[model samples]
Target: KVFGRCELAAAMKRHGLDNYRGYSLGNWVCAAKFESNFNTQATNRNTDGSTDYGILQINSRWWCNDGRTPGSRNLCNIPCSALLSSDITASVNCAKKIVSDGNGMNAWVAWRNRCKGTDVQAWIRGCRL
Candidate 1:
């Protein structure tokens, strides 16, 4: 189903994970909980070693979409300050690969098997609300 794919892709894009392996929305949530309590609007002051903002805890000045390339700004507007650019989609894609090339989903499923849970932001840099 293309629509389903689109929806799923959208989920992946929003959380900064748009790839075959970027399907670890669940694991991401797990880590996110440990880090930012899954609060989409979360913003931590620590820029270097701190997790902040939203479910994904986008750093206050971490531009998820800048410098990665020369393209259009993220439609979702994830905030370059936190991710370093406006290219939310691309940023999210990078984030996905950062966490096991999206293999995080395996971690997620395993985690949920014993825990249970949830999500991503491929095109939208910042964490999902």
Candidate 2:
């Protein structure tokens, strides 16, 4: 479903990733299409200690209300889901940060490494931004 190369370009430009190859686009598309169905305002309710919402899939209840991280605004102090917040740019940036410390292609590479066994490249590439 990745119909527009320009839209991808815009997202990358907004994220300051204009120099990367087309590989990382897979992760971005996969994260958006499959994870949240491209819904930037999506939210999830975790019954256990987990995260909710968009691609970053933030679990605010665990960190914001439960004090899981034991500190303030500690993205990695708690579970994975507690890392992301609002703003698709910010949230996906968090995921990008985790993948490569905001170092470019690390997030996408991690996703590629993570999904190698399942043959998810097509799914990632086919997604529309």
Clashing residue pairs in all predictions, respectively, total 32, 5
lDDT of 1 at 109: 30
Write one digit per residue (lDDT tens) for candidate 2, span 1-129: 232434543464467543334444544554455445555455566555444555534445432333442333544444343334333455545554455544443333334445434543454344343
Find the 10 residues in a row with the least total lDDT in model 1: 1-10
Instruction: Write down the TM-score for model 1.
Output: 0.35
Cα shift from native, residue 77, model 1 (Å): 9.5
In model 2, which residue pairs have backbone atoms overlapping below 3 Å?
1-126, 2-127, 51-59, 52-58, 52-59
Candidate of highest TM-score: 2
Q: How well does each candidate superpose onto the true structure, as a TM-score?
A: 0.35, 0.48
Q: What is the Cα-based lDDT of residue 17 in candidate 1?
A: 47
- Tens-place lDDT per residue, model 1, 1-129, is 111223433554465543445344544444444543433344455424433334444432333333333433343345534433323343354445444533454433323453234333332234333
